[PDB]
Amino acid sequence: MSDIKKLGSSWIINWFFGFNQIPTNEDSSIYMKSVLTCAKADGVISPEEKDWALGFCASWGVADWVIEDLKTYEADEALEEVIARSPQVSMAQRDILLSAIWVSAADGELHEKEKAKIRKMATILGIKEEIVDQLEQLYYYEAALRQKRLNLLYPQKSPY
Amino acid sequence: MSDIKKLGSSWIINWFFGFNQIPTNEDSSIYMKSVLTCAKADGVISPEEKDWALGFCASWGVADWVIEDLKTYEADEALEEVIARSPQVSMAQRDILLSAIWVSAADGELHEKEKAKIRKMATILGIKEEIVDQLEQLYYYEAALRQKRLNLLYPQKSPY
Numbered sequence: 001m002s003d004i005k006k007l008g009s010s011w012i013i014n015w016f017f018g019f020n021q022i023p024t025n026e027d028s029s030i031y032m033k034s035v036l037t038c039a040k041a042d043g044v045i046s047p048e049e050k051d052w053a054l055g056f057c058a059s060w061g062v063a064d065w066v067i068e069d070l071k072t073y074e075a076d077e078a079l080e081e082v083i084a085r086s087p088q089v090s091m092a093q094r095d096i097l098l099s100a101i102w103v104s105a106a107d108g109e110l111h112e113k114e115k116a117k118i119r120k121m122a123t124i125l126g127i128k129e130e131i132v133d134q135l136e137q138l139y140y141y142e143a144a145l146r147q148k149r150l151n152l153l154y155p156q157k158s159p160y
Numbered sequence: 161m162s163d164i165k166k167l168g169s170s171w172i173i174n175w176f177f178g179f180n181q182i183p184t185n186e187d188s189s190i191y192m193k194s195v196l197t198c199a200k201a202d203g204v205i206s207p208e209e210k211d212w213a214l215g216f217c218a219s220w221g222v223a224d225w226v227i228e229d230l231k232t233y234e235a236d237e238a239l240e241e242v243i244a245r246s247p248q249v250s251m252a253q254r255d256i257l258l259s260a261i262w263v264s265a266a267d268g269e270l271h272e273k274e275k276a277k278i279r280k281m282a283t284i285l286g287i288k289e290e291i292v293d294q295l296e297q298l299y300y301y302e303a304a305l306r307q308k309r310l311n312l313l314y315p316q317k318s319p320y
């Protein structure tokens with residue numbers, strides 16, 4: 001990465017995850033595969049949901065291979081096996097779940113099906129229900145506060 | 161931009177600003193020069209404040225030239241003159257002020273000196289005090305919710 005690329009990537013990685021180092025492309029890949037597995041869970045993941053996930057991943061400034069490989073990835077592997085590919089991703093259980101919630105929300109408000117999926121995955125991930133409930137709440141609050149931001153900045157027309 | 165670059169830049173621009181189109185590099189530049197002018201306002205802008213601003217801007221996937229030029233930019237121009245350089249940035253007064261608040265907070269909690277500056281710039285921007293107070297409150301909420309997220313995701317160890 002260029003120094004300017006590293007500036008943007010470090011900032012955004014720190015912004016969303018609190019990290020003081022940019023994850024390896026390999027780790028970004030494994031993390032996103034986990035997220036997609038989690039969001040898809042039993043069922044399917046819609047194009048819109050997958051597109052949001054890929055866009056989120058691209059924003060971190062990952063190498064192109066990571067996105068091209070996610071595009072063709074069939075998230076049909078066992079979630080516990082995926083996370084075990086990396087010691088770093090294997091610390092990321094709550095982080096993965098939260099991103100999976102946001103991905104699932106991308107194509108509309110969470111249905112009971114999607115709430116059921118997330119809990120099935122949280123069980124696989126070893127996350128207690130109280131924590132799952134807190135992560136869902138955090139999602140709703142984050143989504144609501146973003147909407148509040150946008151409506152305050154641009155109540156009428158937006159330039160772009 | 162490549163399709164993958166557009167993917168990530170679109171995503172992050174929509175995420176922070178609600179925009180459906182990536183701004184031109186010139187508009188990103190003019191916006192950020194306005195933010196830096198606002199943050200500096202009366203007085204001075206610390207290296208840490210400026211670094212946060214540059215990293216924020218770089219995270220949108222702007223061309224390198226934008227960042228290189230912001231590095232040497234002396235934010236000594238009149239705020240209303242900078243914003244008038246773009247019809248898009250001329251709609252962005254509240255957006256600029258919120259980013260300026262975040263920039264000011266990057267090197268520590270807002271002092272009454274910074275709060276005084278913000279209001280001086282808001283007057284130049286034509287923003288009413290009630291709205292200034294709302295933007296500052298939004299900043300506090302956003303910063304607190306982010307801390308909450310990070311403590312919930314990684315209460316003990318973090319992978320990166």
Ligand SMILES: O=Cc1c[nH]c2ccccc12
Nearest residue numbers: 023027028031088089092
């Ligand atoms: O790469 C992005 C990312 C976000 N959270 C985690 C956690 C562990 C490895 C990588 C990542």
Ligand SMILES: O=Cc1c[nH]c2ccccc12
Nearest residue numbers: 183187188191248249252
């Ligand atoms: O370029 C980033 C940006 C964020 N808000 C606005 C508003 C107007 C022009 C550009 C921008």
Ligand SMILES: [Cl-]
Nearest residue numbers: 016099102142
């Ligand atoms: Cl998010």
Ligand SMILES: [Zn+2]
Nearest residue numbers: 104105107108
């Ligand atoms: Zn969904």
Ligand SMILES: [Zn+2]
Nearest residue numbers: 048106107108
């Ligand atoms: Zn939709």
Ligand SMILES: [Zn+2]
Nearest residue numbers: 224225226228
């Ligand atoms: Zn250059």
Ligand SMILES: [Zn+2]
Nearest residue numbers: 264265267268
């Ligand atoms: Zn400050």
Ligand SMILES: [Zn+2]
Nearest residue numbers: 289290292293
């Ligand atoms: Zn007031």
